[PDB]
Design a protein around this ligand. Sequence first.
Ligand code: Q7F
Length: 274
Amino acid sequence: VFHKIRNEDLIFNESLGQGTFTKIFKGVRREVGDYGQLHETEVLLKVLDKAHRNYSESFFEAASMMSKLSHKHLVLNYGVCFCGDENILVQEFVKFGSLDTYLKKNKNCINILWKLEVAKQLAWAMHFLEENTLIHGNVCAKNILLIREEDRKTGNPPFIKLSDPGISITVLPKDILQERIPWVPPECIENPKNLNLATDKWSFGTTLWEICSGGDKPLSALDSQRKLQFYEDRHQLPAPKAAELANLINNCMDYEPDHRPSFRAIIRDLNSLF
Ligand SMILES: Cc1ccsc1CN(C)Cc1nc(N)nc(Nc2ccccc2)n1
């Protein structure tokens, strides 16, 4: 169970945008830290309306279950504020933010070896989740959080974490799932009860496309109905700008869920692109 954080100890300072039935802020948590030291810690706050009770329960159960698994590539959630009519996730503030925005701000002036390192780190996160049989369900480049930029002098790569899962596609409205094509795989559009570990392999492919397309969104020109039809017609994504990951994307975006390769196999493939 998440640590409870008092509303009194949270300051809200900036409105940052919106997720799926969430409102996002930057703020400050006043906390007693290690050694009893008082810290004012920058935090990312995700606010759910308690009136959307089913969405809130799904969101916080998903965040809590994944935060039980401490991992270098999984975002740190500090706890939850049951803040009256709203429930608030208090998450670490990642310095460089979402990867899709980062790639746009840097005009896709990143090389293929940087892309490979990010892809490997995500695959290692996904392998850990697979070993724990924990479905994420919302893998995408906006949910790749850049902790550190590369440092050419030390040779250190960029370093990422995967964000929390959000509301489950098993409870979201069908129209939201359709807007999330081609991250949500064809079997889950057909029936959201088809959610499975295989879901994340498909979404990982779509996320590799994003990484290799400088933060562009695939199928952005298609409305919900044309995206539903895109799956009816069994189409695949176009090859990305950086074509080096084209094969891996196609192998992951397999319309047969049982044919999508394991994360361990994906890691081996990424390693061999060298
Ligand atoms: C921020 C946001 C907007 C819509 S969704 C969402 C949350 N998340 C997907 C992105 C995120 N998560 C975490 N934990 N930290 C950050 N840092 C950050 C934020 C803004 C600028 C620079 C850095 N960004």
